[PDB]
């Protein structure tokens, strides 16, 4: 039951069904007690029955509607579990990661498969908490809440902060994703090399694993929080470790377009 705008309120459709049941259930009790003419008792018991269906599953027998506005099936608990896209259903379309990022990619020719160019500006938000603490370990800030306000505005960052982040990212690695993640190599781990600007420097050899051209394809970026997730991520998920495809014993770090032409 929530306050929207001006005073609009939003409530899970389930509540209009619940009221259905309760009212009917009560009206029943009162109809039993008042005195009871058979037709009316059943009549009600029928309504009651239907109602009990409604919350559980709507549409198996007729379809309940909120009053004239939307001839829409009030989502029944069933519809909740199943639905066009409901409970176990969208439980798999995806959820939104907390330490994520996404920008445009651009070829990083000097970059080694090992690493990837990540915008410092992006790195900052992404590794914010890892930075905060690091700020406190140095003189840049007295405490967390301090370190936070210290970074709440762009004009207030001392160049000392970059040196902190640059120190926080020392040997950690991130994951980069592509538009259709078709195979496991559709997500690979690299060591970030912070850089200026907006674009994300990607290596050319791995451009074959992810089907990525540079006309604007934007890659996302995720962060391994646990020491474990990090252990697995740079040990068995790092780009330079997965060179041969899982489909064919043929390499996928093959010299793509320009390298051949050169060689």
């Amino acid at each position: 039951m929530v306050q929207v705008d001006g005073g609009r309120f939003a409530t899970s459709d389930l509540n209009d069904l619940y009221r259905r049941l309760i009212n009917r259930n009560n009206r029943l009790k009162k109809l039993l007690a008042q005195g009871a003419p058979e037709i009316i008792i059943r009549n009600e018991k029928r309504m009651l029955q239907e109602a009990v269906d409604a919350l559980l599953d709507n549409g198996r027998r007729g379809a309940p509607v909120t009053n004239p506005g939307s001839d829409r099936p009030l989502r029944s608990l069933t519809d909740i579990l199943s639905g066009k896209q409901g409970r176990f259903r969208q439980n798999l379309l995806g959820k939104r990661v907390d330490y994520s990022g996404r920008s445009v990619i651009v070829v990083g020719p000097q970059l080694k498969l090992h690493q990837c160019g990540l915008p410092k500006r992006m790195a900052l938000e992404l590794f914010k908490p890892f930075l905060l603490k690091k700020m406190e370990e140095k003189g840049i800030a007295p405490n967390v809440k301090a370190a936070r306000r210290m970074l709440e505005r762009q004009r207030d960052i001392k160049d000392e902060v970059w040196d902190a982040l640059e120190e926080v990212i020392h040997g950690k690695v991130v994951l980069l994703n592509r538009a259709p993640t078709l195979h496991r190599l559709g997500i690979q781990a690299f060591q970030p090399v912070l850089v200026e600007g907006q674009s994300i420097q990607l290596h050319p050899l791995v451009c074959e694993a992810f089907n990525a051209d540079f006309d604007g394809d934007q890659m996302a970026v995720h962060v391994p929080l646990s020491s474990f997730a990090q252990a697995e991520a740079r040990i068995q998920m790092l780009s330079a470790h997965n060179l041969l495809s899982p489909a064919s014993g043929e390499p996928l770090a093959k010299p793509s377009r320009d390298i051949i032409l050169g060689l």
Partner: peptide, 12 residues
């Protein structure tokens, strides 16, 4: 089947 008709018929 559909509820209104049944009760109507029922008491009518």
């Amino acid at each position: 089947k559909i509820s209104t008709s049944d009760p109507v018929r029922q008491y009518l």
